[PDB]
Amino acid sequence: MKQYLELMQKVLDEGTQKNDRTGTGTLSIFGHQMRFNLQDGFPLVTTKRCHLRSIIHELLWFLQGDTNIAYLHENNVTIWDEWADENGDLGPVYGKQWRAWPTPDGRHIDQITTVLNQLKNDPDSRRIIVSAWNVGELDKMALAPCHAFFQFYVADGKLSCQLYQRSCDVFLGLPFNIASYALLVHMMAQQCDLEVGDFVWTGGDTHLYSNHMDQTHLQLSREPRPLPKLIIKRKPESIFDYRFEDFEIEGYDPHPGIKAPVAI
Amino acid sequence: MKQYLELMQKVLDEGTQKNDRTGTGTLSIFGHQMRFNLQDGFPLVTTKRCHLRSIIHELLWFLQGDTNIAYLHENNVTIWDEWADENGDLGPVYGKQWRAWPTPDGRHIDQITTVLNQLKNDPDSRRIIVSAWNVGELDKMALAPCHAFFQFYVADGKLSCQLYQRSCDVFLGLPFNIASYALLVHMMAQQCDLEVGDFVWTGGDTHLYSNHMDQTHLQLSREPRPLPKLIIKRKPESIFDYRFEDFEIEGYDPHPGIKAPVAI
Ligand SMILES: O=C(Oc1ccc2c3c(cccc13)C(=O)O2)c1ccc([N+](=O)[O-])cc1
Ligand SMILES: O=C(Oc1ccc2c3c(cccc13)C(=O)O2)c1ccc([N+](=O)[O-])cc1
Ligand SMILES: O=c1ccn([C@H]2C[C@H](O)[C@@H](COP(=O)(O)O)O2)c(=O)[nH]1
Ligand SMILES: O=c1ccn([C@H]2C[C@H](O)[C@@H](COP(=O)(O)O)O2)c(=O)[nH]1
Structure with missing residues (x-):
């Protein structure tokens, strides 16, 4: 997509040389923003073939609050296998925060239902938000959330959403993440x-x-x-x-x- | 500043008509991004006079983890008075999350120290983050955090920071918020x-x-x-x-x- 190739060219032109935690080299910029008008069409990249199969299954799995890879195994989706322990547990990642964020006082907060209620009953709200960034639970997650945080907004009969993504592999991850949130919208x-x-x-x-x-x-x-x-x-x-x-x-x-390819 | 007036003109040109929770009308856009190279100079708006006095005191107060307005009263800073209860309590707002985010297991997490450690010992990290968006504590805050979430980044000897601000009054709040985070950087x-x-x-x-x-x-x-x-x-x-x-x-x-002016 125009926006996606522009980002790609931008990182080539402006990226500074930067390692990851494995020590694999990257070209890196900090802070970028793109907008996809969803009425123009579903923003699945066309300059390489992407399959929706795993994107859909993973979203459905997120929405169930499931953090065990079992449901993904049932459908031979393996994208979380590298992070799962021997029983297939990922610790309290996305699904658990979206659907059951734990509080000091023993509650579990369903942020998806919260946000749906808010969109129906109070669409002008400036705090329609889901966060996966549960500071106290980071240590137990197989992975710190990459798509950390998102906000919805309604104006003129139209639902918008903004995602904050702390870390983005533009080549492998970004096309996936975009289609994922677009689906959820x-x-x-x-x-x-x-x-x-x-x-x-x-x-x-x-x-x-x-x-x-x-x-x-x-x-x-x-x-x-x-x-x-x-x-x-x-x-x-x-x-x-x-x-x-x-x-x-x-x-x-x-x-x-x-x-x-990925390094290990 | 160029970036700030551009945003201002953008909202005039592109804002849709939108009410707040009081019912006060706004012109509103969703999703915007600006960049201030801090080596060019401190980004305090010049097209109207802004005073740093309250900005500094409020930051210092945030950094202490203090959520009672007492320290601001000591210095005759009154910007939080409209939200404080009779004893001057704001509930678990910014300072408490920055310095003492509470966990289900009884801990209190100092996110400022965490981030300082990370910047010194692991500057390549893609998860150097402070969040004030503690889902389980929102109900007790006098106010849901406006500057919800921020990330730091180091490349080439330079510290950068990105803020996510869920809601922004561009005229009254934005100049304040920008100078505040710039100071913290x-x-x-x-x-x-x-x-x-x-x-x-x-x-x-x-x-x-x-x-x-x-x-x-x-x-x-x-x-x-x-x-x-x-x-x-x-x-x-x-x-x-x-x-x-x-x-x-x-x-x-x-x-x-x-x-x-503000409506009430
Ligand atoms: O290897 C990764 O681990 C994940 C980290 C965070 C993730 C995923 C998801 C699906 C599959 C993998 C991952 C996902 O939905 O959220 C990864 C994560 C994020 C990206 N990214 O584009 O930011 C690219 C790769
Ligand atoms: O009236 C407001 O209440 C606050 C909400 C959130 C806030 C503040 C801060 C200082 C003073 C007031 C407020 C502050 O540091 O964070 C307000 C909040 C945020 C903005 N804003 O620009 O987003 C403008 C006004
Ligand atoms: O009486 C209230 C108080 C709060 N809010 C919600 C929606 C507002 O957007 C938000 C308060 O912060 P602002 O985003 O409005 O700045 O909380 C309401 O809907 N009604
Ligand atoms: O061995 C490890 C594992 C994780 N991290 C930190 C920094 C990484 O940036 C982040 C893992 O997610 P990425 O941001 O790297 O995608 O966690 C490390 O520094 N070392």
């Missing part, structure tokens, strides 16, 4: 009888791994194709009752997939 | 022996109250003056030992102050 909007507005992506440490330079140059040689259209085949009774088969993408004509 | 950087990089400001609901239109038009008629320079007169032993008198601003030549 479409499900949220449907459940509240709103149309879709903007997904605004904000990044902290926004980087390209040095071993992704050939792929980056290749993708930058390609022209964005028209955006696909998301189809929701069915309207469920709640945000928690979406099924995998509810979602279709039409008009997805991507250039070919490109593989990118 | 200068104190942080000093304590870690780094130079200063960028302050990146990111906003959610970014708005102008309709009863600020005359002031807005007036300020937009003015030309930014050169940025002032922050002087730190002394180097304290820690981030917690700054005193009010440690700070001076040089070369501050602002156009005249402009008053803006």
Whole structure:
């Protein structure tokens, strides 16, 4: 997509040389922002083939509050396998915070229901927010949340959402993350009888791994194709009752997939 | 400042009509981002006079973990008076989360010390973060945190910081908030022996109250003056030992102050 390639070119042109915790080199900038008007089309990158399969399953899994990889195994989704312990536990990651943020006084807070209520009953609110950044639980997570925090906003019948992403692998992670939140905006909007507005992506440490330079140059040689259209085949009774088969993408004509490796 | 007037013009040109919780009308956009290279000068707005007095006292108060207005009363700082109860308690707002975020297991987490340690011992980290968004404690706060969340970043000897601000009154609040975090970057950087990089400001609901239109038009008629320079007169032993008198601003030549009213 224009915005995504622009970010990619920006990091090449402006990135400073920066290592990760493994010591793998990156080119890195700090602070970036992109906007996707969801009425223009579903923002799934076209300059390489991306599959929605794992994105949908992972979102549904988040929404269930499940932190065990079992449901992903049931569907042969393996993207969380590298972080899971021997019983398949990830500690209190995304799903547990979204659906059951624990408080000092023994409660478990369902931030998804909170936000849905707020969107229906108080759409002007400036605090419609879900955070996964539970400071006291970071140590137990297999991973500190990358998409840390998000806010919704309603104006003129349209639902928007902004994500803060503390750390972004622009090549491997970003296309996935964008489509993931865009999906959630479409499900949220449907459940509240709103149309879709903007997904605004904000990044902290926004980087390209040095071993992704050939792929980056290749993708930058390609022209964005028209955006696909998301189809929701069915309207469920709640945000928690979406099924995998509810979602279709039409008009997805991507250039070919490109593989990118990780160091260990 | 260029960036600040640009935002102001943007909200006039692009804001949609939007009420707050009191029902006061605003023009509002969602999602914006500005960058202040702190090496260019301290980003205190010049197109109206702003005083640093209350900004410094409030930051020092935040850094102490104090949530009672008593220390601000000692210095006749009254900006939190409208929210304080009869004993002057604000509930568990900023200071308590920064310095003593409470966990389900009975701990109190000092996020400022955490972040200082990380900046000194692991500056490549992509999770150097302070959050005030403690979901379980929102109900007890006199106010939900406006500056919800912030991340630091080090590259090339330079400390940067990004703030996520869920809600922004561009006319009254924004100049204050910018100078506040810019100050904290200068104190942080000093304590870690780094130079200063960028302050990146990111906003959610970014708005102008309709009863600020005359002031807005007036300020937009003015030309930014050169940025002032922050002087730190002394180097304290820690981030917690700054005193009010440690700070001076040089070369501050602002156009005249402009008053803006609030509805009740
Ligand atoms: O390797 C990663 O671990 C994850 C960290 C955080 C994550 C994921 C998710 C799905 C799959 C992996 C990860 C996810 O939904 O949130 C990773 C995480 C984040 C990104 N990113 O683009 O920021 C890229 C890679
Ligand atoms: O009236 C406000 O209450 C506060 C909300 C959140 C706040 C403050 C602070 C100082 C003084 C007031 C407030 C502050 O440091 O954080 C307010 C808050 C935030 C803004 N803003 O620009 O977002 C403008 C006004
Ligand atoms: O009586 C109230 C008090 C608070 N809020 C919510 C929505 C407001 O947006 C937020 C208070 O902070 P602001 O975002 O409005 O600045 O809390 C209400 O809806 N009603
Ligand atoms: O062995 C480790 C594991 C984690 N981290 C910190 C810094 C990393 O930036 C972050 C892991 O997430 P990333 O931001 O690196 O994606 O946690 C380390 O410093 N060392």
